[PDB]
């Protein structure tokens, strides 16, 4: 008698009907797994710093939680982890970089409670009573990103995390195409995949082409340059460093960097000597010899840029003639603050470097990249996540184009329970879900 699985549940607690705050619960009989535990920055809400998922359902069932599996070190994947760990004790699995960044987050909140970290890579197989869990490298804007593969007797449940495909990224950004093909060939029962850019035809612009266009843009800047991006966009940061070196500009960080210091020590960045300067040293240089990378005190870049624009920032403000490169991907949640910030910058006499119409810059696969993942995985059932409802619908259309049966595509809201019993996949239950608002 071999152990066989009977009942599966997939429950989004965050990351659907929105693009951040990923958190997906998978249950296989009496074992429960949490896939990601992200935060989201507040929508144009009052006195809120961050929003995290309501995990009451997990707390009610906490004796069954076997682990928290983190795909990558960005706030969309790990921003709620410290808050989850206050409520429940479970092991935390993630790549070496992901684990280091979670530790830094715990340290920043002065949480001294013991945590069971377990570093994993693409050769790790974690064995539980009901299932085994394996991992594969993905391409994203932070290295050491992993997809998660839960092996069941019905086939695999694959969670992509956030990903794209771009042959100009290498090393710790290279995707495990052969391992992914093997997972697909062996049989995927359900694919849970990132819908963020599912509305956008084609492919993301390759990062080499982006870097070349950034060079051209930056070369035209006559005064100071401020780059606004996520601290977790290591690709963009590296590009800025490269370009600064070529243009004889110094680089200074404005924002909490913790992430950079940790990643540099682990060897993730290529940094010229004498390139980086402390932020208090910037006013000592000519304006045309500095780039400031402004990533946000809390990790939210547009808030920091808004402060600078309105001359409200504690450390450094915008001045007339400054140029702004906004390297962020707008969401519905953010479109008001972005619009307001752009207006504030123009009022302040700053120059916003235009979007190139020929460039589509994102960290998430556009249609053809999502189709590539669908065609490699060949899932039986499909659950588009990480998106507003319209993105999830666009992704569902891609799945149907690739051959997924339309009746096997599930469009879910937070708290919905997709369930399988070996006979039928249903959506017939809801659990508690929602937004927990966090301030200072």
- Binding site residues, Mn ion, CB under 5 A: 74, 76, 162
Residue 220, token pair as written in the block: 């035209």
Least separation in angstroms between CB 174 and Mn ion: 17
Residue identified by tokens 């409200």 is 312
CA distance between the termini of the chain: 54
CB closer to Mn ion out of 76 and 313: 76
Least separation in angstroms between CB 230 and Mn ion: 8
Least separation in angstroms between CB 97 and Mn ion: 13
Least separation in angstroms between CB 73 and Mn ion: 9
Least separation in angstroms between CB 52 and Mn ion: 16
CB closer to Mn ion out of 66 and 76: 76
CB closer to Mn ion out of 184 and 299: 299
Residue 311, token pair as written in the block: 């001359």
SS3 string of the chain? CCCCCCCEEEEEEECECECCCCEEEEEECCEEEEECCCCECCCCCCCCCEEEECCHHHHHCHHHEEEEECCCCCHHHHCCHHHHHHHCCCCEEECHHHHHHHHHHHHHCCCCCCCCEEECCCCCEEECCCCEEEEEEEECCCCCEEEEEEEEECEEEEECCCCECCCCCCHHHCCCHHHHHHHHHHCEEEEEEECCCCCCCCCCCCHHHHHHHHHHHHHCCCCCEEEEECCCCHHHHHHHHHHHHHCCCEEEEEECCHHHHHHHHCCCCCCCCCCECCHHHHHHCCHHHEEEEEEECCCCHHHHHHHHHHCCCCCCCCCCCCEEEEECCCCCCCHHHHHHHHHHHHHCCCEECCCCCCCCCCCCCCHHHHHHHHHHHCCCEEEEECECHHHHHHHHHHHHHHCCCHHHECCCCCCEEEEECCCCEEEEEECCCCEEEECC
CB closer to Mn ion out of 27 and 388: 388
CB closer to Mn ion out of 189 and 234: 234
Alpha-carbon distance 74 to 299, whole Å? 9
Least separation in angstroms between CB 74 and Mn ion: 4
Least separation in angstroms between CB 142 and Mn ion: 7
CB closer to Mn ion out of 27 and 194: 194
CB closer to Mn ion out of 184 and 365: 365
Least separation in angstroms between CB 233 and Mn ion: 9
Least separation in angstroms between CB 198 and Mn ion: 15
CB closer to Mn ion out of 161 and 184: 161
CB closer to Mn ion out of 36 and 322: 36
């Amino acid at each position: 008698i071999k152990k066989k699985n009977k009942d599966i549940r997939i429950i989004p607690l965050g990351g659907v009907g929105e693009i951040a705050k990923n958190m997906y619960i998978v249950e296989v009989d009496d074992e429960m797994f949490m896939l990601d535990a992200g935060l989201m920055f507040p929508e144009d809400m009052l006195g809120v710093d961050i929003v995290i998922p309501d995990i009451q359902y997990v707390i009610e069932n906490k004796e069954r939680l076997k682990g928290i599996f983190l795909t990558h070190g960005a706030e969309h994947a790990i921003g709620a982890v410290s808050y989850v760990l206050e409520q429940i004790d479970a092991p935390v699995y993630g790549s070496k970089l992901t684990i280091a960044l979670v530790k830094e987050a715990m340290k920043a909140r002065n949480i001294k409670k013991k945590v069971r970290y377990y570093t994993v890579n693409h050769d790790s197989i974690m064995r539980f009573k009901n299932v085994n869990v394996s991992f594969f490298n993905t391409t994203h804007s932070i290295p050491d990103s992993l997809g998660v593969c839960i092996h069941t007797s019905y086939g695999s449940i694959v969670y992509t995390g956030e990903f794209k495909f771009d042959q100009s990224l290498h090393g710790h950004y290279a995707p495990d195409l052969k391992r992914m093909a093997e997972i697909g060939d062996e049989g995927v029962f359900a694919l849970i995949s990132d819908s963020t850019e599912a509305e956008k035809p084609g492919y993301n612009t390759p990062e080499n082409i982006i870097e070349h266009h950034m060079y051209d843009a930056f070369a035209k800047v006559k005064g100071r340059l401020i780059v606004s991006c996520y601290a977790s966009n290591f690709v963009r940061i590296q590009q800025v460093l490269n370009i600064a070196s070529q243009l004889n500009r110094k680089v200074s960080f404005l924002g909490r960097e913790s992430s950079f210091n940790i990643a540099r020590k682990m060897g993730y960045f290529d940094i010229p000597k004498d390139l980086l300067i402390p932020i208090n040293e910037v006013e000592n240089y000519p304006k045309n010899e500095v780039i400031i990378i402004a990533t946000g005190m809390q990790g939210e870049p547009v808030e920091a840029l808004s402060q600078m624009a309105r001359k409200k920032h504690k450390i450094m403000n915008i001045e007339e003639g400054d140029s702004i490169f906004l390297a962020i991907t707008a969401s519905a949640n953010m479109e008001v603050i972005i619009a307001d910030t752009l207006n504030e910058l123009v009022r302040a006499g700053a120059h916003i470097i235009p979007n190139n119409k020929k460039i589509h810059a994102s960290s998430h696969g556009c249609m053809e990249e999502l189709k590539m993942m669908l065609n490699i995985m060949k899932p039986e059932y499909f659950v588009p996540v990480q998106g507003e409802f319209k993105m999830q619908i666009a992704h569902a259309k891609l799945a149907a184009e690739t051959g997924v049966a339309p009746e096997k595509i599930f469009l879910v809201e937070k708290g919905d329970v997709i369930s399988y019993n070996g006979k039928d996949m249903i959506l017939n239950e809801k659990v508690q879900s929602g937004n927990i608002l966090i301030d200072g």
